[PDB]
């Protein structure tokens, strides 16, 4: 690869992780709540 491509792949993966983490955070809350109700 080139360094321009690398820069793009970096940013894309970073954006994907930030999204996954936001989704995991939301699911954690939904699970902890459902667990509190039970």
């Amino acid at each position: 690869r080139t360094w321009e491509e690398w820069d793009r792949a970096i940013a894309e993966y970073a954006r994907r992780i930030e999204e996954l983490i936001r989704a995991a955070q939301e699911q954690q809350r939904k699970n902890e709540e459902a667990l509190r109700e039970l």
């Binding site: 360094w3 993966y13 992780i17 983490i21 989704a23 995991a24 699970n31 667990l35």
Partner: protein
Amino acid sequence: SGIVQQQNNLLRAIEAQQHLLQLTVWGIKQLQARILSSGGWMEWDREINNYTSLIHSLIEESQNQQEKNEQGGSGIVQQQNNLLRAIEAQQHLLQLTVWGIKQLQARILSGGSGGWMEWDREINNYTSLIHSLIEESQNQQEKNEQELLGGGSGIVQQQNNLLRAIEAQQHLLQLTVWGIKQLQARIL
């Protein structure tokens, strides 16, 4: 199921972090071919390979288990073990890239100025934090493996632990990226 779905979210975070980590290994390798000709770099390479193959094996196994689990709850405790091992392995691999960035940085830049003292502080802070989170997850994991056989209270807790470890790992990955970028702009 929210629990199974959370396992999937974590596995996929690890997976994507693994590609980010491999990208940093490559950027280091480019920098190292431009700056050096081994002085510990032979060993470093062998270590990079070893951890990389182990992470792949743990990721693949976790992929296996994610399939079974999708539909008592032991397959999710077992998967959690593999996710934790993947995170530990990734942490080792990230430490290797930290060693690599420092070696190269010392050849071409003084450690003062340019955000490097801060970079060093922040690396030490999140290294300590992720080691504590890993320790807490190992305690929780051993407890979960005991409470089975024989519910899903420590399962949800462990999801929380693993998530926090992932998040700290992401901070460390952002730091290594910044370090590599500084070196690239400097001599490439």
